[PDB]
Swiss-Prot record, chain E:
GO terms for cellular component: extracellular exosome; extracellular region; membrane; nucleoplasm; nucleosome; nucleus; protein-containing complex. The modification N6,N6-dimethyllysine is found at K42. It comes from Homo sapiens. Keywords: Acetylation, ADP-ribosylation, Chromosome, Citrullination, Disease variant, DNA-binding, Hydroxylation, Lipoprotein, Methylation, Nucleosome core, Nucleus, Phosphoprotein, Ubl conjugation. The keyword Phosphoprotein applies. The gene is H3C1. The modification N6-succinyllysine is found at K19, K42, K85. The lineage of its organism: Eukaryota, Metazoa, Chordata, Craniata, Vertebrata. This is Histone H3.1. The modification N6-methyllysine is found at K19, K27, K42, K85. It is found in: Nucleus; Chromosome.
Swiss-Prot record, chain F:
The modification N6-(2-hydroxyisobutyryl)lysine is found at K12, K25, K40, K58, K60, K72. This is Histone H4. The modification N6-methyllysine is found at K1. Changing E44Q: In a breast cancer sample; somatic mutation. The keyword Lipid biosynthesis does not apply. GO terms for cellular component: CENP-A containing nucleosome; chromosome, telomeric region; extracellular exosome; extracellular region; membrane; nucleoplasm; nucleosome; nucleus. The chain holds residues 21 to 103 of 103 of the full protein. The modification N6-acetyllysine is found at K12, K72. The gene is H4C1. GO terms for biological process: chromatin organization; negative regulation of megakaryocyte differentiation; nucleosome assembly; protein localization to CENP-A containing chromatin; telomere organization. It is found in: Nucleus; Chromosome. The modification N6-lactoyllysine is found at K12, K58, K72.
UniProtKB/Swiss-Prot annotation, chain G:
The gene is H2AC4. This is Histone H2A type 1-B/E. The lineage of its organism: Eukaryota, Metazoa, Chordata, Craniata, Vertebrata. Keywords: Acetylation, Chromosome, Citrullination, DNA-binding, Hydroxylation, Isopeptide bond, Methylation, Nucleosome core, Nucleus, Phosphoprotein, Ubl conjugation. The nucleosome is a histone octamer containing two molecules each of H2A, H2B, H3 and H4 assembled in one H3-H4 heterotetramer and two H2A-H2B heterodimers. The octamer wraps approximately 147 bp of DNA. The modification N6-succinyllysine is found at K82. The chain holds residues 15 to 119 of 130 of the full protein. It is found in: Nucleus; Chromosome. The keyword Glycoprotein does not apply. GO terms for biological process: chromatin organization; heterochromatin formation; negative regulation of cell population proliferation; protein localization to CENP-A containing chromatin. There is a cross-link at K2 (Glycyl lysine isopeptide (Lys-Gly) (interchain with G-Cter in ubiquitin)).
UniProtKB/Swiss-Prot annotation, chain H:
The modification N6-malonyllysine is found at K85. The modification N6-methyllysine is found at K15, K77. One of its GO terms (cellular component) is CENP-A containing nucleosome. This is Histone H2B type 1-J. It comes from Homo sapiens.
DNA sequence: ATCGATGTATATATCTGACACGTGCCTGGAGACTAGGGAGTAATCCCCTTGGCGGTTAAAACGCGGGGGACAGCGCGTACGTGCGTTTAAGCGGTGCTAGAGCTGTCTACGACCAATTGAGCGGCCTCGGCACCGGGATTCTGAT
DNA sequence: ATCAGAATCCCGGTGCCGAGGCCGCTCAATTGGTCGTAGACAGCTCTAGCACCGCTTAAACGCACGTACGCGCTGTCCCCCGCGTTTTAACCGCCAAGGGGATTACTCCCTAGTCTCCAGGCACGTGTCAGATATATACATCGAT
């Protein structure tokens, strides 16, 4: 069969709002952190717990940004969050010009 | 074999007061621990700012009370102030 | 002890040592650690009590971070106190915008 | 290597956020936003680390970095 | 009667109230509003004149910085008029109540 | 001498002027009531802390330093009033 | 050179800064070079703001830096504007900036 | 019978930067509050850095990394340069 | 499209309050010694990070078709802007009262400090339960029928 | 409606590991006892906050009218979604190397503390000039005509 497009989305929403485990994968994020820290002081090291904390912080940040972005999109009568939605949410929270 | 401080057993005792059958998992233990640290650092920082603002050298219960009235929002503030007054008063009641 | 003298569970001695060796002021009135330990214990009892109940709703006898997040974010004046605090392994509040629901 | 934040992972983050329908350009924008946030936080973490004359960014360094950004993070021995 | 096309006077008023810097809320009604709000906290307070002026500066700064974000939200919804849903979205994104 | 209902001292042209400074080109008619509500909420949140700093100083006069301290606490530092 | 300020080539008072660091309860002790460094940083930041403000004043053909000019200096400079983003400036006004959609065609 | 401020030092810096531009009274109040704000920020950050490391003294190292934590990029680099220059000169001779 | 005239911007003459400057005192900055405790430095242990790998499998990536949501265009009605005339109450000055901020002396309670000591707390260790889960059953969703 | 095909929810046996309880010990909290001083209390002084009146006049209000714009409606198309298949690389467990964190012992120098000058800074008072406005003038530009 086939679900009317727009209901697997609500089901995934409910599934990911009952969960707590981290959504971004672990090793990709770890390599991202190490790459970004390569540009500040070469040959660093990372306590595994510190990478985990960076991931918790980043995921909480992105989740909040997408909540506010969804609010902007819904405000424009749309349903799909678009780039200008993220740009407006950040320009109002005061994160970039 | 050092002695690292943390509010583990204290939060645990308050838990056993308020839910004599509910345990608490080490990660939620760490969260309660960092919550105690965060709130205590906020309150003491505001008490310090009060003291220096009025050119005093003592953080007395007056400064802690005004810190609580500044940080915690309305109803939480009133009930926390009551709890602290009661504790301090009881402390004065002993010797 | 000195926490028992005040009917507290949080250690007034430790809070004194931290108000003294923390450089918050030169002097610390002996009635300050008591007040502060009481406010900390009250807020911890508040958090743990709301947390416990949520865990009991999830028919569980063991608080985990999710339950702390549910308690802190459902209560209106605990939210405002920890409005800028992310709780590790906390998840979010189940909340689907009413415009997105089917029709 | 930023591409490690795959399209489905950003999709999952948006689901948790409550986003129902996601455009196609949200992915590049979100990679950019994440890279900015990580730049700032890891910059402060590495600053605290360098100042402690260490070479391993520890959990307390990232916790302090986030507190300094104004995003206090409970749960890592704060 | 002779009349500019609507929008022109609003444009020149934007120019004029962004050049100048004098306080915009009329002073005495703001002093009265401050005293009336303060009565609910401690009866018979006295307000240093400069303290009332500091409150007025902060309040005008906040309302101007809120109408900026409101205008951003309104333009984001392909409108020109700002409307209470815009103000409420701005304040919900910023983090206020 | 009690005062009541001075939130209508933030008149319609005053809010219109504040908006025109903010850049707004055309204001809807229900902006006035929402703006008065917003202004009153902000003012309460600031004057509560101003009065609390006062009472803790045992004074009975809200200094400008108390207002500045209240704003610095709300996270909206104000420059130009001493301290 | 007698006073520490002149010995450090600054203009901000190294001594007053040392006192404020001591009777401010930031730490039990305050190293010798900490007031020097902190006063140098304060002097650099105020020199930058006053330089930009003076330029903003010279633009409008005035001779006195009023608050309007400090606001123009701070807001119109990305790095200061990031350092002073949460800072209202009394009498500051706002940057003259009409949104790009509102202008007529 | 004294009140502290920076009202004269900022004036010296002004005359050193713009040798013929006065500064109003309210603008002097603003700058006098800006210096106090940056001072409390850098000092509070240095205090946090003293405790986070179980140090006790605010050396110049602490103030330096505090300036790096607070001021954004190029302001941070230039401020650190000015600080180390002033410190080194003070150490000299 | 010219008027035109409204409005903006440019030019000079005047006034005046704010500022830039010249003193007199004073108190806080600076200097010289002393002392001791905080920080540097070296040695050593051992944990904990990094790297490498092999396998498996869940997840990512890719193709595709289709439908549903974004976006543009149009119409229509309202509701916001604009101009005038009338009303209101802010702003200013001036006076007058006084409540309260602010400074100062005295003096006592209170808190720092030090030495003894004693129990509370931390760490290692171990036993039990509580949660995850698998599985089977039952009910309730979504969607074509 | 209905019927189905999953999706979700309930209930129960089961394993694993992590949390909760116990025990030993060392170290920080407690308790006296002493001393210095912070701060409280009162009392004086005078600044500044409040209250009020009367005028002038700029701003707020109210009203009328028109037109721009918000909003609903419709139509088209493109671009996400959902699904099935193929690929890829994350997870995990294990092992080895060794780098660096953390601790301890020793030593030195850097800063606190104190006392003794003395000049940098602040409040006072004063003279003047930068800027706001008046009056006059040149030109942009909005727009219905």
């Amino acid at each position: 069969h086939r679900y009317r497009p727009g209901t697997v989305a609500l089901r995934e929403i409910r599934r990911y709002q009952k969960s707590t485990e981290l959504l971004i994968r672990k090793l990709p994020f770890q390599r991202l952190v190490r790459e970004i820290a390569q540009d500040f002081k070469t040959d660093l090291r990372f306590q595994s717990s510190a990478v985990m904390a960076l991931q918790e912080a980043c995921e909480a940040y992105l989740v909040g940004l997408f909540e506010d972005t969804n609010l902007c999109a819904i405000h424009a009568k749309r349903v799909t969050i678009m780039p200008k939605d993220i740009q407006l949410a950040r320009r109002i929270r005061g994160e970039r010009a | 074999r050092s002695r690292k401080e943390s509010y583990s057993i204290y939060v645990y005792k308050v838990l056993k007061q308020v839910h004599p059958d509910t345990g608490i998992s080490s990660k939620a233990m760490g969260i309660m621990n960092s919550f105690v640290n965060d709130i205590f650092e906020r309150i003491a920082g505001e008490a310090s700012r009060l003291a220096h603002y009025n050119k005093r050298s003592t953080i007395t219960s007056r400064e802690i009370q005004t810190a609580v009235r500044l940080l915690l929002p309305g109803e939480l503030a009133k009930h926390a102030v009551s709890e602290g007054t009661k504790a301090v008063t009881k402390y004065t009641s002993a010797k | 002890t000195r926490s028992s003298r005040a009917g507290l569970q949080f250690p007034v001695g430790r809070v004194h040592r931290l108000l003294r060796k923390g450089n918050y002021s030169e002097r610390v009135g002996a009635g300050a650690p008591v007040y502060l330990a009481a406010v900390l214990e009250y807020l911890t009892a508040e958090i743990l009590e709301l947390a416990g109940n949520a865990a009991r709703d999830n028919k569980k006898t063991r608080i985990i971070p999710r339950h702390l997040q549910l308690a802190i974010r459902n209560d209106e004046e605990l939210n405002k106190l920890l409005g800028r605090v992310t709780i590790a392994q906390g998840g979010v509040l189940p909340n689907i915008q009413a415009v997105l629901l089917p029709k | 290597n930023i591409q490690g934040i795959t399209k489905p992972a950003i999709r999952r983050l948006a689901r948790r956020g409550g986003v129902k329908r996601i455009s196609g350009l949200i992915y590049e924008e979100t990679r950019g936003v994440l890279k900015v946030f990580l730049e700032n936080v890891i910059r402060d973490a590495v600053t605290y680390t360098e100042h402690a004359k260490r070479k391993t960014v520890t959990a307390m360094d990232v916790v302090y970095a986030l507190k300094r950004q104004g995003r206090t993070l409970y749960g890592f021995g704060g």
